Design a protein around this ligand. Sequence first.
Ligand code: VP6
Ligand code: 2HP
Ligand code: CA
Ligand code: CA
Ligand code: CA
Ligand code: ZN
Ligand code: ZN
Length: 232
Amino acid sequence: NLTDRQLAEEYLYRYGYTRVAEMRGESKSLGPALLLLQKQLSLPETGELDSATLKAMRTPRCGVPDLGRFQTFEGDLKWHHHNITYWIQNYSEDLPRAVIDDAFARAFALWSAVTPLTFTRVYSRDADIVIQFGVAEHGDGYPFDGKDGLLAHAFPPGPGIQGDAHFDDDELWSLGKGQGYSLFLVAAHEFGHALGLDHSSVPEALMYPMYRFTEGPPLHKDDVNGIRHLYG
Ligand SMILES: CC(C)(O)c1ccc2cc(C(=O)N3CCCc4cnc(N)c(F)c4C3)[nH]c2c1
Ligand SMILES: O=P([O-])(O)O
Ligand SMILES: [Ca+2]
Ligand SMILES: [Ca+2]
Ligand SMILES: [Ca+2]
Ligand SMILES: [Zn+2]
Ligand SMILES: [Zn+2]
C-alpha cells in the first residue's frame, strides 16, 4: 500500500534516475528524473507521472540498475576465456530439480548459438557463474524486495561474485503459465548481464528490463548485436 507518488520516488531512486538528476542540479522536483526514465524505457517524454509512466513503474522487472548507482567492479567486464562454467548452488522448492536444471540449460543454449562461448555445468564453488535462489538479504548487501517488483539480478563478468546470478524466491517460479514467472525467460535476461550486456531501450528486446511473458523465440536483433559488439 505505497501511494503512486511513493512508488515513483522509490523506482527513480533504486534504478539510478535520482542520482543522475542530482549530477544535473535537478533533483528537487520529480519531473527531470521522470524525463530520464521515459527516454531510457522508450515511453512518451512528458516529464509527468502519467498513466504510461505509472503502468511502467508497477511492472515486474530486473533488479539491476538502469542509469546509476552501479557498483565499482574489477576488470573490463567481459570474459577472457571461452568455456564458461556454471554451478546451481541451491534450488527453489517451486519446481522439480530436473525442470530448474533444464530451464537454466535452455537459457544458456539461447546465448551459445550467437556467441563464441560455451556453457558447461559443474558442481564446484569456483564455477564462473554461481546460481542461487534467495530471499530479502541473501548475503551480498543487495536485498530483494519480497513478492513481485524486482525478480532477480546478476553481476557483470569477472572474479568471485562477478558473473553470478540470483533469483528472488519470494516469487513463485514456474514456466510462466497459470501462475508464476518463467524461470527460463528471467534466467535468459540475467545470463545476458553475466556475459557483459547492459539493459536495452527496445521494449521487444530480451535485455529490456521489464518482464514480458512470451511463447515466441526470446532473442531480438538488438540482443544479438549487443553480444556481437562484445565477443565477435
Ligand atoms: C553493463 C555492465 C557494465 O556489463 C553491467 C551489467 C550488469 C551489472 C550489474 C551491476 C551491479 O552494479 N550490481 C549487481 C546487481 C545488484 C545490484 C543492485 N543494485 C545496485 N545498486 C547495485 F550496485 C548492484 C550491484 N553492474 C553491472 C554492470
Ligand atoms: O495520464 P493519461 O492522461 O495519459 O491517462
Ligand atoms: Ca562468479
Ligand atoms: Ca521481488
Ligand atoms: Ca518461491
Ligand atoms: Zn536486467
Ligand atoms: Zn544477490
